[PDB]
């Protein structure tokens, strides 16, 4: 019954009414009331005067696949690029890359776009292979 | 107004201080930045019957070296 239906106990607070308060005349006293110009950035305060250029590129970015995920749990399901969709590695937009994180022995075979040196080493050391396209 | 196509209808005109340079000056910088218009030449010839009108220089060079829908 909706009559008896209660609140969340602390979801909603009331808002802020500045009418009344009796000794509320809000904001400052003078000086920087009434304006819509506040704006916490701006020109010469330690933003300019700061000496950077660098060079912007931001090119190819690979999807990180931890070894620690692949080994330990699941089945060694023979990943390829197929299973990654359901394996909770599904993101896309970018190629896939494998690197070493957790260190454990298992038999595993993974098809990704690229991988690191020590990752290769750890996939082979416990036996397995990692495929790459030409 | 012309013979073939378009006439008048023009756009703005600029000027630059620190003009030219060593191609690799400091920069170009600007002053002028105001709107402006364009006109063309008058001439008189007939088509379909005796007439006068006005003739675009392009249209004049066109009509002179051949009759494109018109004669002199």
């Amino acid at each position: 019954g909706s009559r008896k239906d209660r609140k969340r106990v602390g979801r909603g607070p009331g808002g802020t009414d500045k009418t009344a308060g009796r000794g509320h005349k809000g904001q400052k006293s003078r000086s920087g009331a009434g304006k819509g110009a506040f704006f916490e950035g701006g020109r010469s305060r330690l933003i300019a005067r700061l000496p950077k250029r660098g060079f912007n590129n931001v090119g190819t970015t690979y999807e990180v696949v931890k070894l620690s995920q692949l080994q330990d749990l699941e089945d060694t399901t023979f990943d390829r690029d197929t299973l990654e969709a359901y394996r909770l590695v599904r993101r896309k937009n970018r190629p896939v890359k494998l690197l070493a994180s957790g260190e454990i022995s298992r038999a595993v075979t993974v098809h990704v776009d690229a991988a690191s040196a020590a990752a290769i080493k750890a996939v082979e050391a416990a036996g397995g292979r990692v495929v790459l396209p030409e | 107004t012309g013979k073939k196509n378009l006439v008048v209808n023009s756009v703005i005109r600029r000027g630059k201080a620190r003009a030219d340079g060593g191609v690799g000056r400091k920069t170009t910088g600007i002053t002028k930045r105001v709107q402006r218009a364009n006109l063309h030449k008058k001439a008189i010839r007939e088509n379909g019957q005796v007439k006068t009108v006005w003739l675009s220089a392009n249209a004049l060079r066109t009509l002179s070296k051949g009759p494109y829908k018109g004669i002199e």
């Binding site: 916490e40 700061l50 950077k52 | -």
Partner: protein, 59 residues
């Protein structure tokens, strides 16, 4: 705002802010040697809190 991107306001893993050292960039040098490699790494966060507000989305 689009200035602070290629210039360093840069944010780290701890959500701290990288500016480094300005000591002399290009004009006005010809004094000592460790001021020159004195081009640094370092920052305070007192003005970081409002810094990255400019870099907020593409950190």
């Amino acid at each position: 705002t689009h200035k602070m991107a290629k210039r360093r306001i840069k944010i780290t893993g701890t959500g701290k802010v990288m500016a480094f050292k300005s000591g002399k960039r290009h004009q006005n040098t010809g004094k000592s040697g460790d001021e020159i490699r004195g081009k640094g790494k370092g920052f305070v966060l007192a003005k970081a809190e409002w810094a990255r507000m400019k870099l907020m989305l593409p950190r």
